[model samples]
Target chain A: PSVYDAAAQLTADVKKDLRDSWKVWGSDKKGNGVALMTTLFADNQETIGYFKRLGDVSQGMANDKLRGHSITLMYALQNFIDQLDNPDDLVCVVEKFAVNHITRKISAAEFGKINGPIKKVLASKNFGDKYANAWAKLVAVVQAAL
Target chain B: SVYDAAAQLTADVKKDLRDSWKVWGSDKKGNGVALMTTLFADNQETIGYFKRLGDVSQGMANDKLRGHSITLMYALQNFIDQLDNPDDLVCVVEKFAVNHITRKISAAEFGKINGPIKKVLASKNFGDKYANAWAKLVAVVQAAL
Candidate 1:
């Protein structure tokens, strides 16, 4: 069987598990974020990379704000500058990270705050149709993950 | 803070939406693949804003298909799973794309074929909560161009 098929089966199964879990879990559980963050960081790799990258970005943002120097941000930023591919698409990945992990702490309204503009930015510089949609889906998937 | 908050809110919305759709069906149509795609396609400045933020994976950056594929696949699957399975899947997707959230279909359409979910996100003022991020992102997208 193709990996696509395998993935589809996996996805189908996941939806079932998610639905069942939701029914039983309900909203009665306290500190939803605390539980979700711990569970996600343990099972998923994307979440790991995302938090790492966000830390890197956050550190850079902090540097930029601290003084005239933004070397760390620049170095981190250069990782993107050196490349010629879908740079805008990175937002999707970072977002996928957030959806999978961060959404545990925030709300859809908070997530979309970044998403709506991010989508527009991705569109303007000319990314793929599939790419742009992918970010939106990341938002959806993150929502689903929650 | 941005990613953390964005991630949390996105998931909350999705979870709420999953439940919301169960009861409200088409009060709102999410799985924004269709809508976001439509919106993204119409605007490129938005794409640039994302570019300014992070690093991207190239197809041949030592890997023919980077992590991008997995990310994209999850997205496609998200939308695909939500819709009905028909003889002409793409055609059905297209039709659903147009009317996915506008009264033609309900969130439970996916569940009736699969199972039930809630619809907590179908509220009249869901957008009110995250207005700042939404507006800022939109400004970045539409500002320069």
Candidate 2:
């Protein structure tokens, strides 16, 4: 979307820094974001539905909107596909790359050593890192309702 | 005030958690860590305001201890216990962490538990994490203040 009016709570300054910190790739609308491959029949509702599902899952985190938004945005990307109505019951989209993804890649010992420093950094308001929020990959999944 | 009610509410919840909440202290470190973790988080948010006002370490700007979900909530209790300016709280937090023994937890690991949603936001990738945290910290304390 082209900076919808809905982002009012976020304000201009907040949006600027976030945009600077987090790079939304491909298109401003998140179209080229994460990769979305379409095949057969996929509709917007299917994609939207998935986004709604994710929203429901983490709505509790809204109190922590800063953190909550990241999750919502991931789902927003997924919404692109979830809104799609595909009888094939499958779609190709980006899988969200979350913090755990990298942590899991490390050995247990490495995880233990780095975990503390990393969390402290995450808790710090001034800390910054690129991979902090990444969309892993976009792939299809069979709709449960299907 | 909204915060006061929330604080009492959160206190009650924390009590419930303490009683029935899953206790995990891996050698007392976890218990100590869990007990004080929320305070550190609230302090971190308060410190964030100063970080925003002045040019500080990017490292300091980016850290958001409270983002981790499993860390537990009801932070309002601690906020009420400590008296500090919401604006200057981070400095106080820096002092507290410096004075006491605190262990660092990996955000990368928290990102998994935090899931993709928070992973990105807390990552401060979009830039409003501090602003967001500051607001909540104030909200929690505002009730008591």
Evaluate fnat for each of the predicted models and list the values in order.
0.04, 0.00
Q: Candidate 1: which stretches are off by over 4 Å?
A: A1-3, A10-17, A26-30, A39-146, B1-31, B47-145
For residues A1-146, could you state the per-residue lDDT of candidate 2 as single tens digits?
Answer: 11111122233443343344234331222122111211100222233332331234223323222222232233343333322332111121111122322333523333233223322332343434432221111111111111
- Per-model TM-score of chain B: 0.21, 0.22
List where candidate 2 sits over 4 angstroms from the true fold: A1-44, A52-146, B1-145
Per-candidate clashes, comma-separated:
38, 60
For each candidate, the alpha-carbon lDDT, in order, equals 0.32, 0.28
* DockQ, all models: 0.03, 0.01
| Cα-based lDDT at residue B36, candidate 1 | 29
Estimate the overall C-alpha local distance difference test score of candidate 2.
0.28
Query: How many clashes does the backbone of model 1 have?
Result: 38
